[PDB]
Amino acid sequence: PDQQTLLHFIMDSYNKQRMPQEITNKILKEEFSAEENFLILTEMATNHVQVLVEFTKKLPGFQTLDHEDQIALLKGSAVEAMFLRSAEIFNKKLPSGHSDLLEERIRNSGISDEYITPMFSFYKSIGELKMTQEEYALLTAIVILSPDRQYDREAVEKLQEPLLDVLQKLCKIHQPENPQHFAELLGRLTELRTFNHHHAEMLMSWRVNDHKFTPLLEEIWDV
Amino acid sequence: DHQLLRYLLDK
Numbered sequence: 001p002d003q004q005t006l007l008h009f010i011m012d013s014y015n016k017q018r019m020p021q022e023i024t025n026k027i028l029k030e031e032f033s034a035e036e037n038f039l040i041l042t043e044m045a046t047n048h049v050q051v052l053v054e055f056t057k058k059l060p061g062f063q064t065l066d067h068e069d070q071i072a073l074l075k076g077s078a079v080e081a082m083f084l085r086s087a088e089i090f091n092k093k094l095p096s097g098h099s100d101l102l103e104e105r106i107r108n109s110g111i112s113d114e115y116i117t118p119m120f121s122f123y124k125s126i127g128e129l130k131m132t133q134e135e136y137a138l139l140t141a142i143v144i145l146s147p148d149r150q151y152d153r154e155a156v157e158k159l160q161e162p163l164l165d166v167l168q169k170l171c172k173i174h175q176p177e178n179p180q181h182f183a184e185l186l187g188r189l190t191e192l193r194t195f196n197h198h199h200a201e202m203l204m205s206w207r208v209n210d211h212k213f214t215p216l217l218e219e220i221w222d223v
Numbered sequence: 224d225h226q227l228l229r230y231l232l233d234k
């Protein structure tokens with residue numbers, strides 16, 4: 001724990017920005033139909049992007065980075081960060097996530113079976129890791145600060161590696177019996193990358209069937 | 224080019 005203080009304000013940041021209960025109540029409260037399911041998912045996503053931006057801002061030395069690479073990182077990690085947060089809802093059964101009803105809506109929102117299947121297979125796998133909130137938080141931070149996104153890569157690594165080290169330590173400090181556990185997590189990140197292509201195809205399908213998104217989502221996903 | 228993201232970052 002040489003300087004685990006950075007973990008302090010990361011969890012502070014991770015708990016800081018939150019989805020309003022009035023908005024997440026719609027997952028439970030509203031009609032269940034293909035159209036309403038899609039609209040609720042779109043509202044959740046566009047709200048979560050704003051939560052994401054506020055989390056990213058608070059990250060160590062994010063604001064000191066190059067301005068246009070900051071956009072490149074936000075755009076590159078958006079889908080992956082939403083998959084991770086949604087995974088956390090399903091895995092921990094976050095009350096305000098209403099996971100069983102969230103699942104009903106995802107399974108009837110115009111998404112192909114081809115994408116539903118690996119989506120929920122991913123959710124189950126990540127759940128079986130039995131991760132803590134600090135793991136979810138650090139993985140999210142690591143995912144956001146990826147040096148290999150399209151469009152200097154070096155200064156991103158300076159911000160990311162410290163977080164990878166803290167995650168590396170917490171595995172050896174909270175799972176001593178499995179020293180393949182850190183590797184396990186990193187493997188699931190590669191599985192997470194798989195959903196970038198899936199999501200681009202999902203957007204195409206939705207668009208040709210006359211679905212529109214929000215200005216914010218349209219910007220961050222290049223719609 | 225990415226006005227809304229800039230706006231959220233600067234707010």
Ligand SMILES: CC(C)c1onc(-c2c(Cl)cccc2Cl)c1COc1ccc(-c2ccc3nc(C(=O)O)ccc3c2)cc1
Binds near residue numbers: 089096
């Ligand atoms: C734009 C819509 C149609 C969409 O397209 N692909 C996906 C999509 C799908 Cl269907 C699956 C995975 C990833 C994506 Cl982008 C989605 C919906 O994505 C979601 C994004 C965020 C959340 C979310 C995030 C945070 C939450 N926090 C709380 C809380 O209490 O803090 C409660 C509910 C939350 C819901 C749920 C679905």
